Nucleic acid binder design. Sequence first.
DNA 1: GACCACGGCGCG
DNA 2: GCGCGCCGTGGTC
Length: 530
Amino acid sequence: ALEEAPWPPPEGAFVGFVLSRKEPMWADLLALAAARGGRVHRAPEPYKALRDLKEARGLLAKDLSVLALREGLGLPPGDDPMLLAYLLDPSNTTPEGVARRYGGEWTEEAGERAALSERLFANLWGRLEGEERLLWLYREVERPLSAVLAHMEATGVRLDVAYLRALSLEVAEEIARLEAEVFRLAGHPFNLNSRDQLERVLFDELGLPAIGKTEKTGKRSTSAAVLEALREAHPIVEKILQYRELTKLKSTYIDPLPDLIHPRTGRLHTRFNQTATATGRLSSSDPNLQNIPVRTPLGQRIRRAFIAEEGWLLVALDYSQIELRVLAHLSGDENLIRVFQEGRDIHTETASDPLMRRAAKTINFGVLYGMSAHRLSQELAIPYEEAQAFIERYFQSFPKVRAWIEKTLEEGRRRGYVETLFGRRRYVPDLEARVKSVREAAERMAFNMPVQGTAADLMKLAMVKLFPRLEEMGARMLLQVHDELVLEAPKERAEAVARLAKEVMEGVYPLAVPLEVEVGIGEDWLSAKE
DNA sequence: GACCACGGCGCG
DNA sequence: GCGCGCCGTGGTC
Ligand SMILES: [Mg+2]
């Protein structure tokens, strides 16, 4: 890319482009260019020029496709060096960094971005020559997935705006009721939203016992974990907890979301970031729709705001304990495989009563993070000696797991990275740090990655297979929440879509244990998840 | 207006 | 106790 040739470029050229802002559904296309065969082409007028391309090839290809889709153009994303770099090392999350690392500089000029894409792809494609397992993931998973993601982003999800507007007004009144009561008890008003000001009121002015400290600055914590333990030591604690929940939900979801309705589509549009996590998971932002409330009663009222287009229904599909099932497969623990094989509730089969079923439930999902025998003692109110005993029992039942954990750590130590089932890797150097706390944190990141990552690989593969089947049925894929999918289907075909999608997901890639999926259909995200 | 670090907390 | 992104605060620029 030196010789400047008039627009348009030949087929298979690498594209460069500049957006007025990061969100492709909200961005003005400021500039457009392309590079191939030692030439560089600059679009005279970007929007018109966008019609000439057959495929978005280059850095951030998906983002350009979303924008093209926004304009009614079918311009699928192709090769993207970010995906190649992300597979080589998932700390490769930005074009700045990737450019610097593999032979260029991420500028604000379209033509230069185009030439940077061509050059980087050439280099990175070289790195992946011989990495057959990473190459497989690029071709069979990441690249095809990027097209699926572009369609999800361009499609958006419908939101009951009036409903949320109304909800805001109600919650505002309850928050006022809580804050006024807090201020009485405090004997003086202050900024309840300021944790620094709260810290002094609680532990200095009210003399409540401080418990824990914040991580970075070592102030006395006012976290929910701390407050919970004080729910009895003063009536102000409960009111603050109730205040925290309402203001969190109101300020993060109820108020901002209605203002984000796109004028042209009348729907809400997220971004599914494909090179953003250390484990291979997607992330979601602007806004994040992967952390919409669901666990509390108010959270559930908010979720009801996500609804199906008129004439359609939402279809919600959820993998059941995918990470546990993946661990059974990776570890090869016969006993745990056995609990899934004969379709047991696990949390009781593993218990091998009330406390024992809930204890087994938490521990089953604690071994994946390396839950400390302490937090366990906290969760069961059982001494640190008894909790520490369970874990040993849990592992005596499922020895292959400890062996896998230990084997995973040992290998990570030697090679400097760990792998998912498909060979997606994460580099974790701190496995040999000499500070115990730091080393043991790296360890928990390290042996969790193959599990969380494998689950992500499976879900991604499932999306790639499922998407074409949905198009041919006239249904849409709307959201992905790590181990869940939310589709939208015409009422007539909803039931059939629900049936097919479930089967696709369960049979995406058979393991030593079966994958289970629950599927519901409904007019709103909450209704559909029942 | 924008950036950051932090504590805090929403979800899987 | 793993993986994220966003809030308000507090501080800067
Ligand atoms: Mg943080």
